Amino acid sequence: ARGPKKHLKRLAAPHHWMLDKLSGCYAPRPSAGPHKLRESLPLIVFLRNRLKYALNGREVKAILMQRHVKVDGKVRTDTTFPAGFMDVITLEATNENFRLVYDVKGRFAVHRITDEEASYKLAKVKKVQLGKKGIPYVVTHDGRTIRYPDPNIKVNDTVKVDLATGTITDFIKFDTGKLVYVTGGRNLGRVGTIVHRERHEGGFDLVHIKDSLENTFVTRLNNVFVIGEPGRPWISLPKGKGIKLTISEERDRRRAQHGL
């Protein structure tokens, strides 16, 4: 295509979007934003589909235009704004806040966060670079170019963003023995207790990660996101804690917790 592409066809949208392959030909393409359109989640899908707050795209545009949704403390009135991973969505109507965390199966499940800890945010550092005039800046997955960080912060780390001003609050250093959260591929949405970091120097560092129930799995570095030290997750996990129970236990707990 001679230039950028603007239309996204309904089949091409990622499966985790949970879209209906029926009842429409197209899919809402996320605009340019802080996240990859393969990974993000447009507000249209979040509201019309996940929360069932509005039937039709038009009144979703209406909700957006009245400046009620608040992403990271900002209005973000775009109807297809790509509010990506573990951003915060505030609605002063109902006064309720959510945090976008993948569930155990992988998709963007709704997480009801209370107000006071909805203030801040957690970010994975993607680069640390000395900017112009010798000013060091750190950039995260959100693209939030934070200026003047603590000099001993490095790549692959997690930093606590205020989201009131845009400054660092605290940070956790990446190493072994640390509660981590997985954000890509087969182990999407899992929560782990990293046991090993393994190099293969020159490309695609891997990590061996242990769950809460001693089930180890190995995954690439770029899909890894630290969440706290062992035992105290800095952010409330979604229900299920991403332990990744196998299918037989899904049916066994559905039968055990049976009531209709």
Partner: protein, 171 residues
């Protein structure tokens, strides 16, 4: 009916490529060149209409050009332009010297006057002050941040020196 173009220096009609800036053509789409036919500049017999500007007044009055006068259509709009048009003593509050058009719809007499651009409102000064104050505030904030960062690195460097001294003395 083919229009003639200035600067052709020819008594004949010629095909020519034209674009914006030139006459004899208007670009519908942005920046599109069109090859169109235009009449040359030398005047012969083959010209149907001559658009002649009369330069100097003549002895014989012509009925419908000179004795009458078409009213000047639209007054100056920019404030400096109005002052220049009226010669208005720059600090003379040109606001009230605009040429009003009182319009009569037939029964109600209403007012209609041009909005003056470039006019020095208190609002413009408000904007200027806003910009200047914000710029200075931001620059000062950045200087403060740089100062704090320098202090932090001095502290950490001292800590690391103390550690290396402890190790050197220990061994």
């Amino acid at each position: 009916g083919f229009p003639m173009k200035q600067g052709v220096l020819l008594p004949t009609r010629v095909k020519l490529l034209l674009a914006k800036g030139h006459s004899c053509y208007r670009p519908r789409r942005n920046g599109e060149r069109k090859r169109k036919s235009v009449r040359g500049a030398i005047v012969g017999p083959d010209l149907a209409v001559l658009a002649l500007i009369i330069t100097k007044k003549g002895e014989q009055e012509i009925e419908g050009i000179t004795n009458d006068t078409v009213p000047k259509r639209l007054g100056p709009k920019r404030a400096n332009n109005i002052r220049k048009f009226f010669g208005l003593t720059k600090e003379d509050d040109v606001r009230d010297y605009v040429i009003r058009r009182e319009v009569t719809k037939g029964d109600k007499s209403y007012t209609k006057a041009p909005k003056i651009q470039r006019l020095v409102t208190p609002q413009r000064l408000q904007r200027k002050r806003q910009q200047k104050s914000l710029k200075i505030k931001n620059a000062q904030a950045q200087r403060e941040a740089a100062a704090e960062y320098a202090q932090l690195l001095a502290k950490r460097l001292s800590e690391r020196k103390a550690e290396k001294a402890e190790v050197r003395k220990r061994r």
